[PDB]
């Protein structure tokens, strides 16, 4: 009686999904196109929604663990691309600390993950779902995609028509351990900064702005640099450019001589270069039958203004595991539709959000494991 559940992309949501399905009973079996846990990402926040759902996890241990392992940020300077500005509830924090976390503990779980499988072909009869890796059909009761902006699944469940589209701004950013800056004198102002706690930079240009901060105590440095660019060709989270490219950028800037050498003692002098994306709403995250359902990034990416992106893949995960222990292995059809149900607004109403700041407490405050709870049966009788 107990439910067979297929998770595509480890990712924040995938992680979530796989430990939140787990600890509801159901039996996940997770694939993961990469040969490792590759250890990439930008720093990115956790808000106190997905809070909610993580400090349940072994007595609160995986909080306290991405507690440590924050960006411990007093205050945030902003200056501009000569001289100062202006000096200003959740948490800062590095993708590559968030997810690394996330894996150890699911792993710690028991649960079944797969590694190096690179999954583009899904199907669905009327009692089962499933993928194929490497050749070979792996079958379950139901499968969550949540293979990012990128994702392959959203083209096999909801067609190739809606991509993911340009938004005219792309990034170029890294991150490294200080040691690699520390010694180098056009750098004493980010490295000497008050100890045990984190330094944000901001630094704002005419249509360049460029960002600078530090993480773990001290321990990380990361930067970025966001500029208007056209005809930007990346077109995955790991293309890389040079670091010259962001120098350039900056190359009539008055604090060049402060910010250069943080781009410059990158490691390889190479950068990750990344347009910012928007998509459009999906006119359905499930498959025809009912049993597959695309999350995260791979249904909704947000702008990156919202902050958005990591606390909904973590909603997503502890949605979908609520929904399918309260329906149940013979309605597991209805389950995944109650997902996207109790998702489907709320997403939305964040991304339209962030497009109107692109030119809030309902966000923050809400409890998406009650929600679910206390909605299901709703729902459930209006699908
Ligand atoms: C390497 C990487 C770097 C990122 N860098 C940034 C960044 O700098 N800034 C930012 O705002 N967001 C970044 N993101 C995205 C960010 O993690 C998300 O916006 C959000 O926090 C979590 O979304 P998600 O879990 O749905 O998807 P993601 O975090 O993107 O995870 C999706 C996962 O699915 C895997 N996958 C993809 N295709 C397949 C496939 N065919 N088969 C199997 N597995 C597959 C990917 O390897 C990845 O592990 C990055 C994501 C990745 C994977």
């Known amino acids: ?58 007595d609160g241990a995986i909080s306290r663990a991405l507690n440590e392992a924050r960006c411990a940020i007093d ?34 779980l028991g649960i079944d993950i797969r ?16 993928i194929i890796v490497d050749g070979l059909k792996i079958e379950a009761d139901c499968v969550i995609a949540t293979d990012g902006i990128h994702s ?9 028509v809606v991509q993911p589209k340009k938004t005219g701004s792309a990034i170029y950013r890294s ?20 100890e045990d706690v984190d330094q944000l930079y901001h630094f704002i240009g005419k249509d360049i702005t460029v960002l600078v901060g530090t993480g773990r105590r001290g321990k990380d440095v990361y930067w970025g640099c966001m500029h208007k660019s056209l005809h930007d060709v990346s077109e995955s989270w790991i293309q890389v450019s040079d670091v010259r490219r962001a120098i350039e950028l900056i190359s009539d800037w008055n604090v060049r001589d402060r910010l250069e050498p943080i781009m410059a003692c990158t490691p390889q002098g190479k950068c990750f270069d990344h347009l910012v994306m928007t998509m459009d709403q999906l006119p359905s995250w499930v498959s025809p039958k009912h049993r597959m359902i695309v999350l995260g990034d791979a249904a909704h990416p947000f702008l990156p203004n919202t902050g958005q992106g990591a606390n909904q893949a973590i909603e997503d995960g502890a949605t979908v595991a609520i929904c399918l222990e309260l329906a149940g292995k013979n309605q ?32 923050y405050s809400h409890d998406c494991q009650q929600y679910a709870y206390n909605e299901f049966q709703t729902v459930a009788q209006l699908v």
């Open 152 to 160: 392959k699944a959203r083209n096999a469940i909801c067609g190739a």
């Open 75 to 108: 205050e945030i300077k902003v200056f501009d691309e000569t001289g100062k500005l202006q000096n200003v509830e959740g948490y800062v924090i590095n993708r590559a600390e968030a997810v690394d976390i996330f894996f150890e503990y699911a792993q710690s």
């Open 332 to 363: 597991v059809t209805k389950g995944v539709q109650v997902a996207e149900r109790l998702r489907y607004q709320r997403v939305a109403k964040i991304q339209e959000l962030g497009h109107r700041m692109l030119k809030p407490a309902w966000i």
């Open 175 to 194: 991150g490294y351990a200080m040691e690699e800056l520390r010694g180098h004198s056009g750098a004493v102002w980010l490295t000497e900064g008050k």
């Open 115 to 130: 590694f190096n499988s690179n999954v583009t072909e899904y199907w669905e009869t009327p009692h089962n779902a499933g």
């Open 1 to 58: 009686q107990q439910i067979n559940v297929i998770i595509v992309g480890l990712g924040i949501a995938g992680l979530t999904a796989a430990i939140e399905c787990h600890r509801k009973g159901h039996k996940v079996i997770a694939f993961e196109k990469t040969p490792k846990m590759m250890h990439i990402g930008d720093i990115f926040s956790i808000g106190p929604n997905a809070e909610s759902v993580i400090r349940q996890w072994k």
